[PDB]
Amino acid sequence: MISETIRSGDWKGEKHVPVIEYEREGELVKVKVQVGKEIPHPNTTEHHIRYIELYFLPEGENFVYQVGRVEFTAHGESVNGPNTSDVYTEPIAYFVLKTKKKGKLYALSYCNIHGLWENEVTLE
Amino acid sequence: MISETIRSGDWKGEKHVPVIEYEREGELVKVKVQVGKEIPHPNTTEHHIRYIELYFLPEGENFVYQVGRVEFTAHGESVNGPNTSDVYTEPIAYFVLKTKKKGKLYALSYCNIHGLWENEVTLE
Amino acid sequence: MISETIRSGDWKGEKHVPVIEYEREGELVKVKVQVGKEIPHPNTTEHHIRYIELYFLPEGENFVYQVGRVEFTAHGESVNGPNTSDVYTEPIAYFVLKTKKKGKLYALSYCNIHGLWENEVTLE
Amino acid sequence: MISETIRSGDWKGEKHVPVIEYEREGELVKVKVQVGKEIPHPNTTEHHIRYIELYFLPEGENFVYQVGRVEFTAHGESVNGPNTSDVYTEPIAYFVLKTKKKGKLYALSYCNIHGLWENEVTLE
Ligand SMILES: [Fe+3]
Ligand SMILES: [Fe+3]
Ligand SMILES: [Fe+3]
Ligand SMILES: [Fe+3]
């Protein structure tokens, strides 16, 4: 199963586990997900976080919903060689979710050489 | 764990599990992944397969690689209402992978109302 | 040319043109792109903004770089019918760009029934 | 206009323009899009084709439809260095479109260091 390729862990001391944080404002839920909170993850042409996806499984429901996907596509690559463009997209993803439901939020991130990583938090 | 939202077994009545098939030609591995092979999954504005992702974990290695992602973006929507454009993208994905390695291939797919689905096959 | 399918205009009078705003903080450039600033764009199962992409062409250079892509994937769809999930992803995209270069930022957004839309701003 | 960053003609020496080919079978239109058909475009960790998108504008209509998007995500990167994984995703995209309409098909591709490229063909 695919779960055997997905890693998780303590974000407070790592650099791969996506950290999920949110702030509820009325019917709006602003979610921030990032890799490399405590320890910045490298962002080079050879080693970088490709994307972060956010999912939401409402409490008591059977099917998870993909809320969004953020792809970080600039990693220094240029005609002058790797790490020469001075253009890098940091692995920080923001999602504005409109819902009055509660449940669980899951984040799935992919490092180009270190596989898949996950994390989750309860959405009160 | 996000895996708690991923199903690997179809329920009788609707096909969701992405079926993986491949053909090895020299250094090339042609992979076909599809949802609803014989009995098609619905493809309406309201209910459809959004995408299929292909992953490869080489034998004996520790990090899975994302081979590709195919998004099926047309589902009949139009200014004249849902299911009126006569333009639909079928959930059939093809990937041309160049590798001489062996291992396991995983497929992850998403139904807009039925969550995540997975499958895997051994790449010999 | 694909440009014949891309529309542009005044966001103060329309509701499809992606509005670009940024803030330069040290070596970081925080870019906010959104559709429906003045006039909120519908976000229903039948009619919604699918994604917003950000591009950067550094001053004096020949090749544009894709900075990122944000996909808004929840639009009310559920097993209970269209617009019944109470889960919607608003078309607001945030990008954290690390660069000391100046140039032009382009935004490309896609509405599921109203085609492609663009906008641009000078990154000073 | 973003079109000022999109090229439609290759320069001798490197293939970038996505070549579109299709086959009509009943209500199904099988579309194949590829970069570097005759002369392969590089596919290294430092230089590679990131994705190909397919669009369809039905004859006489005003809004283009995105048919699909294929992301080629493996480019040799590994913990053992750039170009060491022996896993590369070739820039060949296949789309199965269900439609009885005619019109124009557009392809948009992106090289990580050579910007955006386009091409189009009439769907008879
Ligand atoms: Fe890493
Ligand atoms: Fe389904
Ligand atoms: Fe619209
Ligand atoms: Fe190139």
Contacts of C90 in chain A (CB under 8 A): 28, 96-98
**D16 and D107 in contact (C-beta within 8 Å)?**
no
Contact at CB, D112 and A77, closer than 8 angstroms: yes
Instruction: Spell out the domains of chain A, with CATH numbers in brackets.
Output: 1-124 (2.60.40.730)
Closest among D6, D11, D111 to D52, alpha carbons compared: D111
Q: Residue for token digits 């792109």?
A: C33
**A97 and A29 in contact (C-beta within 8 Å)?**
yes
Q: Which residues of B are annotated as a binding site for Fe cation?
A: 14, 16, 41, 47, 111, 114
**Residue C75 annotated to the active site:** no
Residue D67 phi/psi, 5° resolution?
-85, -40
Closest among D124, D122, D106, D113 to D33, alpha carbons compared: D106
Q: Resolution reached, in Å? A: 1.7
Closest among D41, D42, D46, D43 to D82, alpha carbons compared: D46
Contacts of C116 in chain D (CB under 8 A): 64
Give buried/exposed letters for C69-104 (b at 16+ CB in 10 A, else e): bbbbbbbbbbeeebbebebbbbbbbbbbbbbebebb
d(CA D4, CA C6): 12
**B22 and B121 in contact (C-beta within 8 Å)?**
yes
At residue B10, the 3 state secondary structure works out as coil
Question: A29: which 2 tokens?
Answer: 């839920």
Q: Is A97 in CB contact (< 8 Å) with chain C?
A: yes
**Residue A75 annotated to the active site:** no
Strand arrangement, sheet containing B92-98: B19-25, B28-34, B92-98, D88-89
d(CA A31, CA C84): 22
**Residue A90 annotated to the active site:** no
- Residue D74 to chain A, least CA–CA distance (Å): 8
Helices (H), C15-112: none
Nearest-by-Cβ selection for D113 from A73, A78, A113: A78
Which is it for the CA torsion D68, C53, A2, B62, positive or negative?
A: positive
**Residue D23 annotated to the active site:** no
**B67 and B36 in contact (C-beta within 8 Å)?**
no
